[PDB]
């Protein structure tokens, strides 16, 4: 295929957690749920992330259930059975901006913005291709590609075409910690966020990895070891024939 | 006051209970009970009675307040449960079931 | 260290123990040396390290 | 030499159905054997064609049971066919160990297909146990509730492991999909025990209602034994047919055609016929702990035969008092069974205690005497 | 303990001459009104009371509770339940 | 237990379904569904039940459709994600008068009326016992009996006291078909329907076990008769012994 | 009547493609003689005797 | 075709003496160093061929077809690639 078609394949870029030994960088993770709670929850939800799930990650319990707290979900009927609202609980889900899929694309001139729970594991590239989309939105189109009406120029899209416009601009955010709030940082930030959401076990994952590797590498070096050391009668035999 | 506090689907009756209807509940002989309990055996702290507010009978939930012992009337079967939430009249077996609630604060209970 | 061989080695049902005695034993100082050496490795980046602000 | 022997493949096929020397003189009582081989077959086809329409989510069971009855085409009849087949394996396992018991099945040289017989029949309780809480009806969640809680009653552990096994803190959604999962494999475990204790079995052959030695006088496997087993089959094919297409709901309880409401409990909770001897057996003891230990000793205890069993001769044929012993104990088996069902009033409750202690002195008191002097009577009566 | 066909593990057997006819040259049924009559009852009568005395017993031990137990829980038996209990 | 507590049990009434060979009568189910239309969906639902499954037993393909045509049901969201009603089709099911439990129980001083797609097998009894409960309402309570509020006396109910009031009076319903509409009418055909409703594949599983009886009655018989044959050699084998 | 065994019966061929003939004819015939004997011992009772007024 | 331990169905076989030492008396190590360079370097050399001459001989086929199929997608392609479908 064209290489427009596949979409231009994204930069390597060192990841704080790319590498065996590395974890996320948990302040990171921190700044990147607040981009994705001021810029892409306008239009896109994290629906298999709950409060608790950011507790002991990104925030303490109060932080978590102060998140919750300010939203209404839908409770169980009134005695009346009359529907009714509740504060959110830790058990919650992070809820979305539209009700279905129908108001999501007449939202957004008929593009359906994804889910973004998976959208690290369900892409080539990963964090890296998150990256590369957000910060890839260049300042013109290359002269003479087509767009669509309603649809914006990035490479790193298939087609070249997408239906989100280049949301991150210096300062759209206000970082909590003092971090310059630059295109970069926060597409940073948001990246690493959502690699986090796709596999919240990353950590614990890969030093239970590590572990692993050192006792299966000395059962294996040991395995060796007995295996030359029962086979040594075999391996050691010598004959002595006298045809009779 | 008694609230309603859904967990695991059944709802929780807790009520605040006032001085006087403590000693309401603490007069009743244990042994003219279907079920003989006391309500210290019940509640942990005098002034929370926390039940499960499904009724022993078939699982209908009882109005509080109501009753002819005034504590909660099952309207399905007509069971009157106490203020410690002891069965007196009616078809249901049992007392009202307590959960496993501790006071974590004296402000919050878990349940 | 005949000794050693006669106490721990010799009989099965002693060398069967030792061995879960001592799997028991690596099993928990390996978890502690893993959890010290995985936290300076990774220093500044996880939580219990930036807990410390709220 | 013939293909059939030749060949290692069809050779293991011949010396279990085919070439295998069976004693010419084997009763009716012997077909059980194959019968609870169709019930198995029948059992596996059934059941996995439901697995290809049920659902394990605990909000959706209910109603993929339903589907099952009503939207799936022949629907009706693989759900009636499984859950009375499960009937039907219980009363041909039942005939089948009480032939084994009656002639002796469980004395030397035959004591490990017996012991591995004792192990299959804990699986299919076990089996018919979780499939029962699939459907999720009021019987289904009662029935997980009060026999995971009796687990309650383990020491110092017990709570621990009632929490482990339903994944949660009461039967839900957790508990409903890790039996399904369990139901699904259980059947292939318990077909590989059936398999284990043939093969033991093939070392001294099958006993035989005489009680004495087959190899003077042995018949092929087949045609013999496959056109026997036939006249089984079809007679349990009929009786079969009786419930699943003119009565399918005679042996079941209603309840569970209720969907489950953790709040409401039904009028009475009682378990599947099959298991109420050992239901019985367990009310008797008033202890928690002592009922469990009680229950689970109720079908161990199955494995001393081999040692209380004192007779110099197999099987009971040729033993009158054996025989009258048998047959209390047998009716007393049964007895209990009806114990299981009735409510926990007087005068029952006296007499299920009465009941429990006959059945565990058949074994510990009653079968050894009644043998010793059996011996001796032959001995001296033939003098 | 079992051997197989041709090493059966039968002590020798001499002096033994078996004797049968083809299936096809046999009455399958042959006399099957005299046995399903005749020889159905011996073979009945010789072990009925093996059935019948276990039986009758537990029948009546069932018998005897279940009646009681309907007694125990009328207007008549309210007493007797009580002391029962 | 008392016999109060168990319920009176309900006498044996000979259907027309009971007997091996015996069907419903269509006729009276066509006339129990009338019943259950205007009398019990007032607080009883029939969850289980699709308009498709009435056609070809009671009503034709144009008297079902009619019957889902008049009701409205949640359709998917319109283009803007505004919810929508659409006009019922045969695949719906038949709609309850309640919303919830909670509605259901305001409206039934606390008692929940069960669904009524099951019922005829979720009771000891089946249409017997539906059939003996709604005809079994005294005129007056045995005296002594001590009613709760809102309970009614019906000794076939367990306990005696049940939620659900008289509701079948002579008259209630006028059948289309012009059967008198008595009490025992009414009960007799919409136990029918319910039964019905619990067991569908009623009439084709006896017919279907009608066939198999016949085939494995002649296997059975013809099973004997190749065992017998088979067997004959040795059944009829004699010895001669010479003691050597 | 040999001439009846030898053509159906002798070779196996022969006897089970009878046999399986046979099956067919049985299947078609007794589906529409137990169809037309449970119509007449279910008559007025079922769809197809009450459908005419609709 | 193949028996069990004492009649596996070898020739018979005579006038072999086999020897062999304990594992415990030997030292399983031995000359590892010269068999890990020595002896594994002799059996490489001689098998290399059979591997070097078809992996290099596909690696090749790869590398032009994929290069062929980059170079008819691009612009310089255009015409080539109209000619191929
Ligand atoms: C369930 C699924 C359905 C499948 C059918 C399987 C059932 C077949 C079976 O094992 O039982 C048939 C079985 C027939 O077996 P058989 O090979 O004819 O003889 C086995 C005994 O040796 C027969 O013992 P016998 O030769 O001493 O004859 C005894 C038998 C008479 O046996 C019959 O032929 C009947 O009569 C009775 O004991 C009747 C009891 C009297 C009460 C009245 O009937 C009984 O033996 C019934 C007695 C059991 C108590
Ligand atoms: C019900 C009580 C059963 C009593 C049986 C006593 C023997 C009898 O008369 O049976 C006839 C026959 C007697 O057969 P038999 O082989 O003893 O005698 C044949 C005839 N003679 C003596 C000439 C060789 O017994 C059986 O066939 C008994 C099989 C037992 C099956 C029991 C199943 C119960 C499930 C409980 C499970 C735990
Ligand atoms: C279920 C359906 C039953 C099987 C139907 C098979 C048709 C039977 C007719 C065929 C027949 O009699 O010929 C024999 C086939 O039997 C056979 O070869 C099979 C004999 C009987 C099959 C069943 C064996 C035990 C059944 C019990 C079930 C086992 C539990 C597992 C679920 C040939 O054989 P022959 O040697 O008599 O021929 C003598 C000459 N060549
Ligand atoms: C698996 C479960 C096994 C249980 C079988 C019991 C009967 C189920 C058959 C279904 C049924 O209702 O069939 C009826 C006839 O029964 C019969 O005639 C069937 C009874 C005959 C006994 C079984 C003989 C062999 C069956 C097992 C073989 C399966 C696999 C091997 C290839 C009528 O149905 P219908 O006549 O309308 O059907 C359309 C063809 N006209
Ligand atoms: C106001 C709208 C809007 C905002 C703000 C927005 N998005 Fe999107 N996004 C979309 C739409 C619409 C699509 C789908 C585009 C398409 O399929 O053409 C989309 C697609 C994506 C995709 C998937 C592209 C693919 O390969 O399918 C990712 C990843 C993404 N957005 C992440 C973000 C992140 C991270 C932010 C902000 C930090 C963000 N979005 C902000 C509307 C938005
Ligand atoms: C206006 C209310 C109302 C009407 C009309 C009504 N029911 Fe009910 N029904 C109930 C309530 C409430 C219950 C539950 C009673 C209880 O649990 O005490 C109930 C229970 C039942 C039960 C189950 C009783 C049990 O064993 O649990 C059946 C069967 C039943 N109704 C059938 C019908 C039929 C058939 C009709 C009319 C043809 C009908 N009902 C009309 C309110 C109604
Ligand atoms: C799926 C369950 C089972 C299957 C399919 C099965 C099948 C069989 C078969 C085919 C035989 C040989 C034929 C026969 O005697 O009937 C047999 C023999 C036997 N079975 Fe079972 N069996 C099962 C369960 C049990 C159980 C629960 C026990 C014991 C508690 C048991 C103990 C025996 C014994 C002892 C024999 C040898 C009896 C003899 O021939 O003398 N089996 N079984
Ligand atoms: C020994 C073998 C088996 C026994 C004794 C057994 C027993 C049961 C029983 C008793 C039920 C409850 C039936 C009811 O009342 O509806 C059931 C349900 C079920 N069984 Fe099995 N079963 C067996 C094998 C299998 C197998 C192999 C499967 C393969 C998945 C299976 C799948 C199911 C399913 C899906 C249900 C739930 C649907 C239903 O209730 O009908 N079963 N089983
Ligand atoms: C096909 C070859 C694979 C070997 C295993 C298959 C089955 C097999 O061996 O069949 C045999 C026919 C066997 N009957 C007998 O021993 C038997 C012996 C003597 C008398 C009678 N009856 C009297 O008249 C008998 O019925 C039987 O039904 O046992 C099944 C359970 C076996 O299934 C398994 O274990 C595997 C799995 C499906 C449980
Ligand atoms: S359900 Fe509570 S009173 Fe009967």
Known sequence: ?244 | ?111 | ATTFYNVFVKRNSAFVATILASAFVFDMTFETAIDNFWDRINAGKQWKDIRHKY | ?383 | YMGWWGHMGSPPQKGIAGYTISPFAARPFAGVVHAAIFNTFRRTKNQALFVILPVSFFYYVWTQASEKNEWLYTKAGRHELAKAL
Chains 1, 6 share one sequence.
């Open chain 1, 1 to 244: 295929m064209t290489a427009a078609e596949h979409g231009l394949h994204p930069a390597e870029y060192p990841w704080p957690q790319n590498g065996m030994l590395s974890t996320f960088d948990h302040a990171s993770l921190r700044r990147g749920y607040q981009v994705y709670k001021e810029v892409c929850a306008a239009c896109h939800s994290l629906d298999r992330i709950a409060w608790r799930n950011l507790v002991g990650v990104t925030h303490t319990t109060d932080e978590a259930k102060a998140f919750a707290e300010e939203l209404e979900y839908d409770d169980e009927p009134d005695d009346e059975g009359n529907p009714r609202k509740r504060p959110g609980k830790l058990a919650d889900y992070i809820p979305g901006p539209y009700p279905n899929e129908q108001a999501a694309r007449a939202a957004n001139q008929g593009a359906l913005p994804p889910d973004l729970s998976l959208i690290a594991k369900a892409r080539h590239g990963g964090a890296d291709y998150i990256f590369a989309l957000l910060t890839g939105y260049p300042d013109e189109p290359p002269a003479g590609v087509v767009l669509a009406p309603g649809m914006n120029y990035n490479p790193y899209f298939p087609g070249g075409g997408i239906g989100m416009a280049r949301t991150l601009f210096d300062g759209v955010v206000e970082y909590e910690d003092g971090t310059p709030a630059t295109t970069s940082q926060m597409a940073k930030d948001v990246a690493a966020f959502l690699t986090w959401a796709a596999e919240p076990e990353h950590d614990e994952r890969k030093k239970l990895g590590l572990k692993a590797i050192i006792v299966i590498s000395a059962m294996l070096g040991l395995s060796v070891y007995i295996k030359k050391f029962k086979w040594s009668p075999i391996k050691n035999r010598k004959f002595i024939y006298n045809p009779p």
């Open chain 4, 1 to 383: 030499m013939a293909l059939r022997k030749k060949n290692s493949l069809l050779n293991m096929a011949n010396s279990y159905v085919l070439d295998s020397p069976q004693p010419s003189n084997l009763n009716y009582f012997w077909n059980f054997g194959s019968l609870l081989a169709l019930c198995l077959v029948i059992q596996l086809a059934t059941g996995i064609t439901l697995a290809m329409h049920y659902t394990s989510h605990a909000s959706l069971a209910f109603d993929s049971v339903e589907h099952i009855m009503r939207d799936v085409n022949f629907g009706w009849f693989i759900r009636y066919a499984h859950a009375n087949t499960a009937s039907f394996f219980f009363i041909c396992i039942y005939a089948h160990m009480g032939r084994n018991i009656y002639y002796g099945s469980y004395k030397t040289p035959r004591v490990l297909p017996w012991s591995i017989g004792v192990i299959i029949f804990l699986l299919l309780i076990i089996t018919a146990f979780m499939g029962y809480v699939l459907v999720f009806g009021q019987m289904s969640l009662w029935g997980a509730t009060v026999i995971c809680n009796l687990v309650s009653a383990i020491p110092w552990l017990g709570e621990d492991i009632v929490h482990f096994l339903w994944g949660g803190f009461s039967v839900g959604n957790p508990t409903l999909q890790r039996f399904f999962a369990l139901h699904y494999l259980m059947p292939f475990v318990l077909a590989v025990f059936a398999l284990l204790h043939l093969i033991a079995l093939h070392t001294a052959g099958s006993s035989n209602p005489l009680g004495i030695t087959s190899n003077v006088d042995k018949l092929s496997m087949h045609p013999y034994y496959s056109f026997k087993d036939l006249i089984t089959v079809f007679a349990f094919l009929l009786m079969f047919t009786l419930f699943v297409f003119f009565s399918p709901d005679k042996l079941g309880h209603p309840d569970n055609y209720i969907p489950a409401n953790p709040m409401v409990t039904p009028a009475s909770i009682v378990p599947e016929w099959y298991l109420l001897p050992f239901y019985a057996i367990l009310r008797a003891i008033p202890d928690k702990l002592g009922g469990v230990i009680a229950m689970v000793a109720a079908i161990l205890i199955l494995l001393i035969l081999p040692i209380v069993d004192r007779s110099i001769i197999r099987g009971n044929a040729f033993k009158p008092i054996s025989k009258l012993l048998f047959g209390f104990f047998i009716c007393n088996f049964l007895l209990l069974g009806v114990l299981g069902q009735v409510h926990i009033e007087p005068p029952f409750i006296v007499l299920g205690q009465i009941c429990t202690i006959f059945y565990f002195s058949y074994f510990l008191i009653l079968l050894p005497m009644v043998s010793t002097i059996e011996n001796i009577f032959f001995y001296i009566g033939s003098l």
């Open chain 2, 1 to 111: 006051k008694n609230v309603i506090i859904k967990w695991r689907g059944k709802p929780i009756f807790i009520r605040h209970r006032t001085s006087e209807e403590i000693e309401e509940a603490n007069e009743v002989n244990v042994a003219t009970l279907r079920d003989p309990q006391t309500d210290d055996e019940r509640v942990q702290k005098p002034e929370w009675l926390v039940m499960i507010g499904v009724c022993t009978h078939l699982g209908c939930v009882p109005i509080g307040e109501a009753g002819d012992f005034g504590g909660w009337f099952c309207p399905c079967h007509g069971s009157h449960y106490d203020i410690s939430g002891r069965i007196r009249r009616g078809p249901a077996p049992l007392n009202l079931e307590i959960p496993e609630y501790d006071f974590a604060d004296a402000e919050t209970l878990v349940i």
